[PDB]
Amino acid sequence: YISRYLTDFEPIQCLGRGGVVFEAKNKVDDCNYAIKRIRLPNRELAREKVMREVKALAKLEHPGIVRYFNAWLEAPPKVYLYIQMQLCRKENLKDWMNGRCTIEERERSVCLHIFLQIAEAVEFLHSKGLMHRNLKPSNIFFTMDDVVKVGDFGTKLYMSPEQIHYSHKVDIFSLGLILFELLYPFSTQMERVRTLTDVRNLKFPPLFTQKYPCEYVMVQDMLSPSPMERPEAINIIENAVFEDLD
Numbered sequence: 402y403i404s405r406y407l408t409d410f411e412p413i414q415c416l417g418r419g420g421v422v423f424e425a426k427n428k429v430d431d432c433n434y435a436i437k438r439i440r441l442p443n444r445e446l447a448r449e450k451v452m453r454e455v456k457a458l459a460k461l462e463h464p465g466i467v468r469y470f471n472a473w474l475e476a477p478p479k480v481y482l483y484i485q486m487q488l489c490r491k492e493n494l495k496d497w498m499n500g501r502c503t504i505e506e507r508e509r510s511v512c513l514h515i516f517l518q519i520a521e522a523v524e525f526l527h528s529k530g531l532m533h534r535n536l537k538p539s540n541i542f543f544t545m546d547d548v549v550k551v552g553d554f555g556t557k558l559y560m561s562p563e564q565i566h567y568s569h570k571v572d573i574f575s576l577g578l579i580l581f582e583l584l585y586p587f588s589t590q591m592e593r594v595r596t597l598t599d600v601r602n603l604k605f606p607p608l609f610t611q612k613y614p615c616e617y618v619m620v621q622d623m624l625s626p627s628p629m630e631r632p633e634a635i636n637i638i639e640n641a642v643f644e645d646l647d
């Protein structure tokens with residue numbers, strides 16, 4: 402038996418655990434790619450649902466969506482689906498925040514620029530009738546050219562309550578926390594978990610509300626306990642704060 406993957410690629414390392422993501426070099430074209438390997442479900446209608454997904458997702462092109470290349474099936478001696486995506490930077494949004502722990506390092510322009518890219522990506526999906534469902538700093542990447550991409554789709558800190566215990570409004574909740582986290586640097590993991598757990602419950606640090614009153618009202622709208630009351634992604638983009646950005 403000849404495996405497409407082993408034939409065409411030289412594996413480099415593992416990138417994601419699970420649904421597994423490898424880094425591999427294509428032999429013909431000499432580029433490195435992120436390759437996700439999914440073990441397909443064994444029942445037919447479960448597979449058919451997954452295959453209908455790759456078909457819808459294949460049509461996706463956007464500056465905030467990671468670039469797609471190829472999708473194929475293998476059945477060695479049960480069945481694996483392989484997905485070839487562009488390889489992003491080693492350091493993700495979580496890595497980025499961790500190396501920048503002072504408010505001087507969290508420039509208001511840079512952070513709103515990063516956030517806007519994520520929001521624009523989510524608006525894109527929502528208009529196609531899709532949703533991400535998996536937004537979080539560790540699953541937000543930069544390209545070799547520092548363009549922000551939302552990560553894999555299709556820790557529960559960034560999950561909306563109705564996700565844990567439901568519509569596209571789940572993505573809106575996730576955005577809320579990311580916006581907060583971007584503007585509010587942390588010193589320790591301990592602090593981070595405590596503060597973020599409190600923010601989910603609308604208990605904001607005073608210094609934040611003092612410094613970013615505009616963004617504060619936005620985060621409140623995005624973190625509404627009633628999903629109905631949360632804004633759409635388009636409303637977030639069409640907000641006053643996203644004007645005159647250099």
Ligand SMILES: Cc1nc(N)c2c(-c3ccc4c(c3)CCN4C(=O)Cc3cc(F)cc(C(F)(F)F)c3)cn(C)c2n1
Pocket residue numbers: 416417422435437454455456458459460461462466467468469471472484485486487488489490491542551552553554555
């Ligand atoms: C350095 C680096 N780069 C990555 N691209 C990744 C990825 C990664 C990012 C995005 C996506 C994946 C892995 C698998 C699926 N994927 C997606 O964005 C969904 C997607 C988008 C499409 F446009 C098309 C498809 C599909 F057609 F189904 F293949 C899927 C995960 N990890 C850990 C990564 N690490």
